[PDB]
């Protein structure tokens, strides 16, 4: 056994002498239970949060099938085939297959999250006419079916699972087979598919990051500046009682009101014409302009100057007609920003905890030094496997932390 010396090796003391997987398993279990309860109680069990809950359920059901077996094998001081009567490595293949399957399903689920988020934000017509709640709920089963179909290659074909040191760490074979048609094929295909899905997810997230900025810039240039102009003119007119500034200040107010009458809130963008939610907007601005016209004609045609009943009636009009739409629009934008900020960190975590396995698989594919234990360097597979593992324990805790309002809004406002 020149390469992969530890194979069918009884002594499991080669790799490490430590115990730190139990605390990780307990932390993940408690965090996933907390997140599951918090998400399923306040939400009565939004497609985005349904995707998040399905992904956390899959992660919880995944880590609890693979951590206790490693713990038991390390406790009994038996390798992955000596602890139980698994003839001809009936457990090493199961371990490797389940690990690869769960990683693939998680990456596909994150890709689906980013894709439907971008589609919902980008094209409201397609999102409202095609995507339903059932399709969003049923992402996990078809993804898992495709993942198991992809990973069931060695059963109906040729695919090599091997054990890296220590006694229990089983994964697909990468290096030093001296060339076969059915050995390096899966080793290249796995990392190629991983990189493709990661790049697709990053592309979708980058599109969704710009669509919302376009929406926010539209709203800020369309409503708030006109609102500020109305407020500033209404403040200016009171502080003076000359007969010249009243009329042109009022016509500046009229210009700002006519500009603001054409704007639109985001959700009402779905159906702009003949909208009662827009008809009330237009009616309120009609009343405001009519009051400005009454102030212009009756009061300041002659040089008589009362102007204060008109100013106070305009203040009542503003405070009673318009503020509802502005407040609800700002709330909607803040909600959407928080949702995409939640999704971005999950994408970053999944992407940046998958580079070592990819570049190791490509390192063993086209580069061939064909030596083992070169300056005691076989821990690359260990690091890749342990990072693919540690993706699970840090996924729901960041969601729990981000959903805590003790500091999630203080840093957002300050920074």
């Amino acid at each position, epitope marked *: 056994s020149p390469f992969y010396r530890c194979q069918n090796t009884t002594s499991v003391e080669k790799g490490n002498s430590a115990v730190m997987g139990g605390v990780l398993f307990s932390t993940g279990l408690l965090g996933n239970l907390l997140a599951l309860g918090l998400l399923a109680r306040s939400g009565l069990g939004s497609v985005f949060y349904m995707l998040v809950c399905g992904l956390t359920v899959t992660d919880l059901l995944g880590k609890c099938l693979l951590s206790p077996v490693v713990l038991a094998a390390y406790a009994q001081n038996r390798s992955l085939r000596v602890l139980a009567p698994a003839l001809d490595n009936s457990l090493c293949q199961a371990f490797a297959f389940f690990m690869s399957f769960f990683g693939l399903s998680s990456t596909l689920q994150l890709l689906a999250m980013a894709l439907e988020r971008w589609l919902s934000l980008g094209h409201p017509f397609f999102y409202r006419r095609h995507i339903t709640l059932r399709l969003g709920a049923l992402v996990a089963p078809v993804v898992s079916a495709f993942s198991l179909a992809f990973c069931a290659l060695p059963f109906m074909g040729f695919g090599k699972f091997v054990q890296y040191c220590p006694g229990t760490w089983c994964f697909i074979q990468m290096v030093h087979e001296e060339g076969s048609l059915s050995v390096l094929g899966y080793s290249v295909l796995y990392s190629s598919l991983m990189a493709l899905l990661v790049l697709a997810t990053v592309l979708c997230n980058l599109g969704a990051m710009r669509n919302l900025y376009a929406m926010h810039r539209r709203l800020q240039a369309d409503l708030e500046d006109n609102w500020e102009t109305l407020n500033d003119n209404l403040k200016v007119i009171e502080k003076a009682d000359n007969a010249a500034q009243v009329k042109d200040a009022l016509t500046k107010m*009229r*210009a700002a009101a*006519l*500009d603001a009458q054409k704007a639109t809130p985001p959700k009402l963008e779905d159906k702009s014409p003949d909208s009662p939610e827009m008809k009330d907007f237009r009616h309120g601005f009609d009343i405001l*302009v*009519g009051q400005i016209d009454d102030a212009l*004609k009756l009061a300041n045609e002659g040089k008589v100057k009362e102007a204060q009943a008109a100013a106070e009636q305009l203040k009542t009009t503003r405070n009673a007609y318009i503020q509802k739409y502005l407040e609800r629009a700002r709330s909607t934008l803040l909600e959407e920003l928080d949702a995409l900020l939640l999704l971005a960190l999950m994408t970053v975590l999944f992407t940046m905890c998958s580079l070592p396995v990819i570049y190791r698989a490509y390192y063993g594919a086209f580069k061939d030094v064909k030596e083992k234990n070169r300056t005691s360097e076989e821990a690359e597979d260990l690091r890749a496997l342990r990072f693919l593992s540690v993706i699970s324990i840090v996924n729901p805790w960041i969601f729990i932390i981000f959903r805590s309002p003790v500091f999630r809004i203080f840093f957002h406002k300050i920074f």
Partner: antibody
Amino acid sequence: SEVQLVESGGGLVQPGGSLRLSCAASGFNVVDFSLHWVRQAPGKGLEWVAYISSSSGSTSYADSVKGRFTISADTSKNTAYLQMNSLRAEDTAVYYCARWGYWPGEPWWKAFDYWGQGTLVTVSS
Amino acid sequence: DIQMTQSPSSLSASVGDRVTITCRASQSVSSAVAWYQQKPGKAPKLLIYSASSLYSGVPSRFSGSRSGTDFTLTISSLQPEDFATYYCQQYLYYSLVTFGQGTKVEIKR
């Protein structure tokens, strides 16, 4: 009928004289539509003179003609009148009367959809 | 009482080409700008109101566009019966109405 604004009261008058331009509108009520006076010098641009609204009875004048021009209207005759009392040299022109609607809606956005043919006013010693 | 600066004063064009005239307001009059066509010796006529909309009966060769404070009148296929004078006017209040200087189009030779 058609929105026609037929004018009268035009001729040669001495400087310092007085004249009464009469604009009679057809097909619509003078109360429902604001009436404005627009004048044009011979071979020059356009110039707006005065504004009358019969529902509110509100009048307004340009800077040059205020205090010397008197705008009025009678709904019984459906007519607008402009009285000129101090005519200087720079008043020989062609005069016409245009209509306008009331806020809000479509009629306000269309400003001067109908005009008048105009009448000649000449002052010379 | 808001100015409407217009340019050029007079332009020479052929028949079939497209021409553009620009009117600039002194301040934001929103979307209330009108265009008028006048032959020598006749009353002016309205072509484009609300700074973009086409008046009823006006031929489709005339188009109006608004870019902030700038307004543009464009004639695509300059027919032989389009050699006249063109004015731009802003209207904000009943006492706030102001016309432009005008421009004249003549024949290339």
